[PDB]
Design a protein around this nucleic acid. Structure first.
Lengths: 215, 128, 174
RNA sequence: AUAGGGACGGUCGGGGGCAUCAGUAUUCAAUUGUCAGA
RNA sequence: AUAAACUAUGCCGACUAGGGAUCGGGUGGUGUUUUUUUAAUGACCCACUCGGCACCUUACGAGAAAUCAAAGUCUU
């Protein structure tokens, strides 16, 4: 026979490996691995991977993590300890399964954008996702209306955001992230809101690290 | 024909993106946190852009007489990211597809982080 | 394992809720899993360990999308066929005004939906107007012509010129 | 005057200004990595 | 300041109406939920009212008909 190919000098030769790791309340483990090009005098091995960014689904805790596997957490390699990639918080999010998931055509959709201030010297932007809940056994039909007077809508925004700006002013990014992923805030918002109009599927759609001091 | 230069791979390793215009089908496999770029072969293959690469007939001309030379220079088990198609422009996905991701799977590699990277944006420039 | 999701408005829930047993059955022939979340109000499709051709998930991504925009199920599942292509054309971000969008959309469908039907007969495609989207299904060329027609109609270009041009093209092909 | 006018509050508002930012996408670039088509 | 300046439908004065649809108040609430060693409250919902929301609808009146709760509208 006469082959059409033959391996001569692999390109992935000068490749060094690393491990994905971020403290905060996520497992110590080294979930997944990254890759980089060897040093070259000018090029500094573990030092190009500075602004690196990894998107990770929650399997970053062994327990009830496989369940809540829709929070897309985005992390930045913040430091490297020989052969290991250390990471701090960068971003928090969700996915299409969930987003498109809770979207029925007979309810109302609410969104609250917020700029929080953490004592850590960190600036955030947190997006909230709210949906109106029925209360009459009538499965939302063309006959069922679960709308909420626009006045009530913003009524919630005003309340939701205001709750979170105070929540952040009193926490550490390590605490905040831990809390944001937890059904803690789902319950709190649920509390302030049933006062204005009973909601369902409440979520913190997205979180962006606006400006993070490096004191 | 390669060998070493900004080297060298190992390699577990790496990650390869798909993509396929409803008139093509891409195939290339770079590496991590960015990276580039040992692997490619796409549409540039068969027939006379009639059937063409739209129908995966050349997605069979994929990887095999193509990307399977990843086993060549060390690449062992990659990672996919289908982007077909452009947008917008317009979505979504092309022919290939199962031929795409599955193809490279029926050989020296492995599924990993199969993420439809297909890019679209918040209301922009209108087509025609 | 690949996964796609889409949100559907509440006024669609009821319909999906009764026809979902057919959806999964239709999807089961490709070993694709699907879930109808009533809380989030979303439809999700995803591959398994028994999916022969994973590429079919892209077709499965189109299905639920068509279902979200009031495309009837018997018409929607035709997407699973190899030849069938689809296209959901958003028409909400062309006009800043509200009741001008109504005028232009109305002109897109026309009186008794005649113009829309004429479009369907000239591009050989299924077309459905719903809210801020125009869901189309057919050949790729026919879909491109529909997209041009719709987008131009939303930019205050009367569809008469396009219909006449397509009419001439149809006549030339004989 | 269960006219009209106007009080005041309670609002409620995609009301308006007026900036403000947030964003996307776009595109500019720029190195990109490759690297014949496109 | 032209207008592919429009429900081809006036209104200072109003009904045949409803049904439903939306945004006010006032009820019940019973439903949630806040408060937060228990609540009350606050929210969510619920019904129910009355405000008026716009719409939609014709057991009515039309006009010369399609349509109209108006153009219904006083031998036409």
């Amino acid at each position: 026979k006469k082959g059409a190919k033959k391996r001569t000098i692999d390109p992935l030769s000068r490749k060094e490996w690393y491990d994905f790791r971020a403290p905060i309340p996520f497992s110590s483990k080294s979930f997944g691995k990254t890759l980089v090009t060897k040093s070259s005098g000018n090029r500094i091995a573990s030092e190009e991977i500075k602004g690196r960014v990894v998107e990770s689904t929650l399997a970053d805790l062994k327990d009830n993590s496989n369940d809540k596997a829709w929070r897309k957490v985005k992390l930045v390699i913040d430091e490297v300890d020989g052969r290991n990639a250390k990471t701090s918080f960068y971003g928090l999010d969700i996915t299409r399964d969930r987003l498109c998931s809770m979207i029925r055509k007979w309810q109302t959709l609410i969104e609250a954008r917020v700029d929080c201030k953490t004592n850590d010297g960190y600036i955030i932007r947190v997006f909230t996702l709210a949906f109106t809940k029925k209360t009459s056994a009538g499965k939302q039909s063309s006959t069922s209306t679960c709308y909420a007077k626009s006045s009530q809508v913003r009524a919630i925004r005003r309340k939701i955001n205001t709750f979170i700006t105070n929540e952040a002013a009193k926490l550490g990014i390590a605490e905040f992230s831990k809390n944001l992923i937890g059904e803690d805030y789902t319950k709190k918002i649920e509390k302030e809101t049933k006062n204005i109009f009973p909601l369902q599927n409440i979520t913190i759609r997205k979180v962006k690290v606006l400006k993070r001091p490096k004191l | 024909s390669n060998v070493v230069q900004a080297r060298d791979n190992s390699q577990v390793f790496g990650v390869a993106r798909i993509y396929a215009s409803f008139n093509d089908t891409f195939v290339h496999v770079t590496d991590l946190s960015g990276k580039e770029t040992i692997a490619r072969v796409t549409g540039g293959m068969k027939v006379k852009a009639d059937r063409d690469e739209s129908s995966p007939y050349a997605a069979m001309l994929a990887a095999q007489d193509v990307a399977a030379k990843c086993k060549e220079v060390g690449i062992t088990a990659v990672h996919v990211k289908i982007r077909a198609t452009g947008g917008t422009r317009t979505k979504t996905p092309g022919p290939g597809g199962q031929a795409a991701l599955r193809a490279l799977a029926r050989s020296g590699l492995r599924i990993g982080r199969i993420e439809d990277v297909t890019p679209v944006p918040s209301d922009s420039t209108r087509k025609k | 394992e690949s996964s796609f999701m889409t949100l559907f408005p509440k006024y669609r829930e009821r319909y999906l809720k009764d026809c979902w047993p057919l959806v999964t059955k239709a999807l089961e022939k490709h070993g694709i899993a699907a879930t109808l979340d009533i809380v989030e109000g979303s439809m999700t499709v995803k591959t398994t360990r028994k999916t022969y051709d994973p590429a079919a998930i892209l077709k499965a991504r189109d299905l639920i999308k068509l279902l979200a925009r009031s495309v009837p199920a018997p018409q929607a599942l035709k997407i699973l066929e190899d030849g069938m292509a689809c296209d959901i054309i958003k028409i909400r971000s062309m006009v800043r005004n509200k009741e001008r969008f109504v005028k232009r959309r109305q002109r897109l469908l026309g009186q008794n939906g005649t113009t829309l039907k004429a479009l369907e007969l000239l591009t050989q495609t299924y077309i459905l107007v719903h809210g801020n989207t125009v869901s189309v299904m057919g050949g790729y060329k026919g879909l491109k012509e529909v997209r041009r027609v719709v987008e131009d109609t939303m930019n205050n270009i009367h569809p008469i010129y396009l219909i006449k041009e397509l009419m001439i093209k149809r006549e030339l092909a004989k």
